[PDB]
Design a protein around this ligand. Structure first.
Ligand code: ICS
Ligand code: ICS
Ligand code: CLF
Ligand code: CLF
Ligand SMILES: [Fe+3]
Ligand SMILES: [Fe+3]
Lengths: 522, 477, 522, 373
């Protein structure tokens, strides 16, 4: 039943008595459900340390992973270039999924095409698919460049992307001068960030490898900036803004900020902004190249150091106070531009916010997860805040990254209770937050289920989720946020301290029970 | 527009295509003639997508794991292969269920073998057996396991059937190998067929020799309702109010036991013909169970379907059907009285997967709205046979529409509202056209039944008449 | 008792069993407390419509007001001028309270002095207090200007500010040329925003009244901006940023954003930035003056129109889409500067966010309160979003402002269920949110108590608070936010839609009860 | 105070309403005058209490007469009477009313004593007029509030002998229960075998004030603010009083032994038992935090716990709000305990040590200088 003036959606409509009785009848009659006491016993068991040991003994099963596959990162990288169509050679279902994933995170159109390889291509290869698809894409969506990656089907059958594209050009399917950079992006290797790395290296190779004769390092008085896999628009914007305030000439390579934030003014813009082909061609003339997320830009680093001959600085991701300081000082040294008074004042204001909020931040225990560079930047900032990271999970991390993070933790008295987990998923993390309960989680939307689980053990065991990372599907416009620089540190600090304060307010909202501590002033 | 105008628009849209793509796409665009009974002579469907044209279609894995198997709540569905497919489809489809997630229900969880390079080179069958053992250890209350093959499984020569057989025999467990590799077929449709065949081969016949289930003459099974936003529940309450006993639900809020009990029912009520007609036909041949298509979208279709269903049973069911119709008449009449004046005459074009492009027309017409265009991602010719009579004359039908095609069609037709998926929503929101997600119900719903109709009318009004649409033009421009 | 490894603060320390027994013994033995059943009955009564009628029949009693007194606004206005010490002629306790209030909202040092009028000044005047205080303030804090306001005691005894300052200059306590603007700021008239208006008018009169002969309107090619009482630093910043993006010459009069946001770099800065005296002197030469918050800048408007001869535009506060559009268009008309593509794109992005979040915003019911201009801007934006304001409360509003807000409500179908209340306090609002429950409140920190009350009736009756306004004491660094312009509209929209989504997540977190609607994607 | 010098001192109203009267939970305190004073002081002091706010307790609410121009010109006595009527109508469970005069009340010739007398006799309710006009530090406000307590509440049960007294009856006077401090003290005294009959004003009720003359010993915490009432009670009821200091283990143990020495041997034995019970807890707190705080320097009742943590009280101090924060000197609030606490008692000592360590050793203080400066 529905009251026309107070229509109910699924919640709370299915809490109506008739629906409740119907669901009870369905369960009792036909579901053959396990008894509720058995379900409670098994759940309690899943919260135990013994279950945690069994869970961490997993070798073949992965449950609730915290990573995606390479072509997703390849598509994100390709979207950062001017009038560029991401083109995944392989099966179309992958492209449907990539597009929907990015649509839900960014709440924006995401342009990507597939050559729709099918059973016939599984034996004969997808060369005809490549020829037809390149021609159709160029004719229909008129990009200035088509950036090609692969689905796992094409990788397994061993489709030669270079040969396929060269044959497409030779047979006249696309013009010879039309730029078609490519990158093999096997989904069974690494993760989405690896696909971003491979795609960027492929594009940079396409535009620079055969024209290095006339390049002179430092000719253009600029610094190349490679952002890596980045899903906060504010991060691109803050890097560009900070470099502008320093008066530092820069080239942001793979800049998708415009195309992921087009205005709603009655017109659909398939393309907007992005790194121009001329910028990529002139990139070897830069003073140096700075990789914002070095731990997934290894192949790009090797190409840039070995071909462009740039002396890429050893810089951590510019997250938090110390690492933003190091980034800015390295930029000052490379460019010769002093750090201006505006950035010094912004740093001082971040320090002021830290001083104002340290009493609520100090000693707070966090589990967290995400990509390696993001995770280590978050850990470093939490250590700078006096917070205690307890469970540090990076599903797509490696042993060298783990060693670096352990060194960072050992550099601080606030990291003595921390453990770093690589190759572990969010079911492992669920066990961790049950057996060694933190105050909060920091992660993507998939953490909400963990919170749900913890609440089912009881309100006292609930671990609230703070949504920082990718993907965030159950909140709106968080992709506009910033995590890098002093501005990003300010935003993260505000989110953390206010999450703590909202939790405290919730715990002290009980009248005559806990509201003695429901302070007006915090 | 006239038929000639729509034909001209189709011709101008196709001009940008290369010759092969143009010739192919010409057969998938049509002007509706409601008198046509054989849609093959007007349009072609269920064909290979044209490469590089930004299709909206998914893959067979989406049709099998995402659509059919995934919603089965007390089973554990392993996305067998690399991590991507399981990750992108995790909790993306709002197939609602009641359970304790991670304990006795597992719908929103992503179970995967997370294939690495060594798995590709040397195979993952040993890994699959080890994974099954670990699943049994860590989720002891699961009532079955399905193994949904991703693309690499069928390319590296893996034999998931033998692993499933051996592990199921050893563990006394139903382990269903599904060969739904993404490269198979041309869309999610073959995924539906493969999933239906897997259900038939590994689950459906479990209780063939079992006669302990007490059966009644009013035993029905809801087939092909995946409980999007509780849709199936909103349907079920009506059928039980009519005096019927809904033994099974396929597969929204579905359990393996009700699937096994389905061969015991008296009637199979098929909502989504496209995804479950295979298993419905098999059940008719094997168990002699009649099946009938029905439509619970909007009061007119709901009343017609309730009466058609009650006609299959005795007089008591018919009397209870009339009581249900009378009980709900004031509610949906109030909904119409409130919302039809705000929606009368508004034009909508739809593009959805396999059933909803034709099934939701009646609800829009109940709100006074007119569907001027419709099309399918992966429908077959029988679906187009069904929808040609439903659509108005000289309306635009599109099969496997490309992004360019749909954008141009919308620009020319200029509908008041568009109902499609997440990959078109923001495109058409940029152009200032109100958009409603007709896959996920825009995280609203249910839309089935009378309560669903109330929600549907409220949502259509809130999106179509939202103030935001009058603000896309800056006053200084 | 305490565990040294897990130390408990007041919450949850006093939930320990021994403390619970102690408190029960204290209550039962010596507090003579009313029976808990009687307390429950009275609470239920306070939630009823009959209690609401009795509550709204109040004439003499004010409970939990939503306003402050004039000198607070005078102090805030004075802080916006370069090297200016706010000086409150009156009793010292007032200044202690003003400083504490602003310290708690801004989490920054707040400079303000008193001349410490006591019983001796109650019978005689405060003239000796003025002379000594002006001399001491100038000698101690070396300000470039001293802006004098009054506490209620000085106003009641009738101290002549002008005569007192003239005497201080005549007897040499302070130099004759030293700027000492003044304003009578009676706490028993209007509210804090009235004090801001009076102080700004006093300063402007001091710097412009006697030098109007050589002033030519428009000769400096600038637009004056008067922000009014403003406690979001982002609002000053966004106004300056938007005017600079337009290339519009402007003068922000009373700009306190620098002094309220000094960096933490090891040194205390009493003064920072602010409107210079030259800017105030040159203000009559501007093309026009734009008052951002006209509904509490009436005296300032009268002076600017009658003395500077500026044709002050009839503009609403630049809040939300339509009013930001109107502000920008009027600025473009006055200055001759076209609206640049950057602001057009920002507007389009705000519209994009509105289209992205309209389904969750539509029909949501809000109670809200604050200062008149802020409240009407919030109401206008909520109407633009498809939300229904139901309880609009402005304790310091007037009948003309209420008529204007009612006109705004009548122009939208989403204003049909809305009522505007002026002169009503937060106890009235508590009754309103009980008898006509909205989905959310939008207000300052005091609203938290109302939320507590609603939760005591039941979880289904709880009205969550969304903290927008002044003062915000129980969250950190929200004073850095923006509420004006497209940027402020985006921040407000994000806050609202994500508050809705967090509430929905909380309501659907119940395992196997309501978590069928615990969607990953929203 | 010297005029024009930016002092932090409050007024008499802050001393009376903010410090003394406002924490009394079951009374309603009318900030009589213009709106400012009650608003700035609303819930600004963390004088903790247990109750149902708006029903039987009112500490965090702001009741005011909200004086307008007409109230200034024509007086506000009639408005005060009408306001009291409305208070009775809308808050029937209140156990009394106080009227805290703001600055204009004394300057406009308002006579709140007569209104209080008439309305209190009419409604059979205690209505306490307080002439705490802000122009009259908060020390004088404390004195005026104490005189009001003496004149209107304290002697209300002089002729009442129905309360059953015990030789172990004590009253905690002048503990404002900041962050629960008084509670943390009370649990010790009741563990000692004493009966805490009265505790005010922190978590204080009017009945506890009325019962205070029935106790055997007055334990004063804030001696400066309630010594007037304490000496009056000594003179009139013959009740001895003494200061107690529960800040830090050393002061807590000394104060407990001094209090127990005023009673018989059973109380002394129970005091030794309490001390022995809590010795391991504060010893563990010291073991954990004294190494993290040894040798640090801080700029009369606070030296105890600081010394118990190995700290020096006094230049470059390591510890001494926002002005000192800008200089980069770690600062702690001595008034609200930085929204932390309690700091009194053994549990309060644990909290105090944790807070001192977290503020003194926070990395934020090490980041004042930019690496390029
Ligand atoms: S199953 Fe099919 S695409 Fe029949 S794959 Fe698809 S939950 Fe669509 S038009 Mo998403 S044939 Fe269901 C469908 Fe229809 S996922 Fe849902 S909305 S009624
Ligand atoms: S103890 Fe009291 S509020 Fe007497 S609780 Fe408070 S350090 Fe005040 S007016 Mo903060 S009764 Fe001391 C006081 Fe006065 S904390 Fe200090 S300044 S002289
Ligand atoms: S068509 Fe379908 S979704 Fe595509 S792979 Fe194939 S079953 Fe799967 Fe999978 S991990 Fe990523 S998303 Fe692919 S590239 Fe492989
Ligand atoms: S010293 Fe003390 S706090 Fe000052 S007024 Fe006097 S009793 Fe009160 Fe009140 S309303 Fe505002 S804050 Fe004053 S100017 Fe008057
Ligand atoms: Fe968007
Ligand atoms: Fe600060």
């Amino acid at each position: 039943s529905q009251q026309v003036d107070k229509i109910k959606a699924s919640y709370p409509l299915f809490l109506d008595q008739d629906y409740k009785d119907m669901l009870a009848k369905k369960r009792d009659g036909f579901e053959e459900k396990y008894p509720q006491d058995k379900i409670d016993e098994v759940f309690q068991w899943t919260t135990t340390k013994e279950y945690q040991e069994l869970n961490f003994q997993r070798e073949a099963l992965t449950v609730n992973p915290a990573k995606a596959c390479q072509p997703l990162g390849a598509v994100l990288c390709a979207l950062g270039f001017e009038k560029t169509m991401p083109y995944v050679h392989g099966s179309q279902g992958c492209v449907a999924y990539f597009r929907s994933y990015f649509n839900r995170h960014f709440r924006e159109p995401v342009s990507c095409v597939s050559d729709s390889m099918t059973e016939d291509a599984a034996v004969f290869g997808g060369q005809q698919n490549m020829k037809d698809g390149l021609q159709n894409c160029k004719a229909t969506y008129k990009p200035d460049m088509i950036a090609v990656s692969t689905t796992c089907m094409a990788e397994v059958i061993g489709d030669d992307l270079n040969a396929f594209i060269n044959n497409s050009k030779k047979e006249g399917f696309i013009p010879d001068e039309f730029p078609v950079p490519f990158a093999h992006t096997p989904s069974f290797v690494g993760s989405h960030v690896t696909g971003w790395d491979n795609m960027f290296e492929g594009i940079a190779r396409y535009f620079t490898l055969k024209s290095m004769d006339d390049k002179v390092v430092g000719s253009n008085k600029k610094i190349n900036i490679v952002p890596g896999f980045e899903t906060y628009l504010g991060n691109f914007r803050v890097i560009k803004r900070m470099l502008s305030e320093m008066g530092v000439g820069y080239s942001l390579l793979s800049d998708p900020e415009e195309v992921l934030d087009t205005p709603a003014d009655g017109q659909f813009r398939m393309y907007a902004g992005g790194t121009t082909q001329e910028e990529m061609k002139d990139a070897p003339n830069a003073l140096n190249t700075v990789l914002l997320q070095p731990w997934h830009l290894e192949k790009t680093k090797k190409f840039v150091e070995g071909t462009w001959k740039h002396e890429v600085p050893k810089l951590n991701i510019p997250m938090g106070l110390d690492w933003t300081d190091e980034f800015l000082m390295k930029v000052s040294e490379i460019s010769g531009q002093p750090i201006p008074a505006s950035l010094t004042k912004e740093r001082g204001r971040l320090v002021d916010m830290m001083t104002d909020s340290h009493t609520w931040l100090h000693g707070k225990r966090f589990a967290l997860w995400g990509d390696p560079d993001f995770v280590m930047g978050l850990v470093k900032f939490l250590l700078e805040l006096g917070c205690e990271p307890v469970h540090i999970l990076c599903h797509n991390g490696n042993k060298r990254w783990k060693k670096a993070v352990d060194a960072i933790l050992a550099a601080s008295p606030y990291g003595k209770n921390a453990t770093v987990y690589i190759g572990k998923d969010l079911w492992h993390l669920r066990s961790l937050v049950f057996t060694d309960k933190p105050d909060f989680m920091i992660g993507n939307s998939y953490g909400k289920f963990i919170q749900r689980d913890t609440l089912h053990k009881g309100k006292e065991f609930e671990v609230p989720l703070i949504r920082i990372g990718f993907p965030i599907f159950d909140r709106h416009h968080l992709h506009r946020s910033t995590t890098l620089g002093y501005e990003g540190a300010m935003q993260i600090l505000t989110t953390l301290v206010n999450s703590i304060l909202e939790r405290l307010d919730e715990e002290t909202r009980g009248m005559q029970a806990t509201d003695y501590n429901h302070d007006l002033v915090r | 527009m006239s038929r000639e105008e729509v034909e001209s628009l189709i011709q101008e849209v196709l001009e940008v295509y290369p010759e092969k793509a143009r010739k192919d796409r010409n057969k998938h665009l049509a002007v509706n003639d409601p008198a046509v009974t054989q849609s093959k002579k007007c349009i072609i469907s269920n064909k290979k997508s044209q490469p590089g044209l930004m299709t909206i279609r998914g893959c067979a894995y989406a049709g099998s794991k995402g659509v059919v198997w995934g919603p089965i709540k007390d089973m554990i569905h392993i996305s067998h292969g690399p991590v991507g497919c399981g990750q992108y489809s995790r909790a993306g489809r709002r197939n609602y269920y009641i359970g304790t997630t991670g304990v006795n229900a597992f719908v929103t969880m992503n179970f995967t073998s997370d294939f690495q390079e060594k798995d590709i080179v040397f195979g993952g069958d040993k890994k699959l057996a080890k994974l099954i053992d670990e699943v049994e250890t860590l989720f002891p209350l699961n009532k079955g396991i399905s193994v949904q093959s991703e693309c690499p499984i069928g390319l590296i020569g893996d034999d998931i059937e033998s692993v499933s057989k051996v592990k199921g025999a050893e563990l006394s467990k139903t382990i269903v190998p599904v060969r739904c590799e993404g490269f198979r077929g041309v869309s999610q449709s073959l995924g539906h067929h493969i999933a239906n065949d897997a259900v038939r081969d590994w689950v459906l016949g479990k209780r063939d020799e079992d006669t302990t289930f007490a059966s009644t003459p009013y035993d029905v099974a809801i087939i092909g309702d995946y409980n999007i936003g509780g849709d199936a529940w909103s349907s079920r309450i009506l059928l039980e109010e009519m005096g019927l006993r809904c033994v099974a639900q396929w597969s929204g809020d579905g359990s393996i036991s009700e699937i096994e009990l389905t061969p015991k029912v008296k009637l199979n009520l098929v909502h989504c013909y496209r995804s479950m007609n295979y298993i419905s036909r098999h059940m008719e041949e094997k168990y002699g169970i009649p099946w009938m298509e029905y439509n619970f979208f909007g009061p007119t279709k709901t009343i017609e379907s309730l009466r058609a269903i009650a006609a299959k049973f005795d007089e008591s069911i018919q009397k209870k059907c009339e009581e249900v119709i009378a009980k709900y008449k004031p509610e949906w009449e109030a909904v119409v009285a409130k919302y039809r004046p705000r929606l009368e005459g508004k034009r909508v074009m739809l593009y959805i997967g396999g059933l909803r492009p034709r099934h939701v027309i009646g609800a829009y017409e109940d709100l006074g709205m007119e569907v001027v265009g419709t099309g399918y991602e992966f429908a077959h010719n029988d679906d187009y046979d069904r929808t040609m009579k439903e659509m108005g004359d000289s309306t635009l039908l599109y099969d496997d529409v490309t992004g360019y095609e749909f954008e141009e069609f919308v620009k020319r037709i200029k509908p008041d509202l568009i109902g499609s998926g997440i990959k078109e929503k923001f495109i058409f929101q940029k152009m200032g056209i109100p958009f409603r997600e007709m896959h996920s119900w825009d995280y609203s719903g249910p839309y089935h039944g009378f309560d669903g109709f109330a929600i549907f009318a409220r949502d259509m009004d809130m999106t179509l008449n939202n103030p935001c649409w009058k603000k896309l033009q800056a006053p200084w421009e």
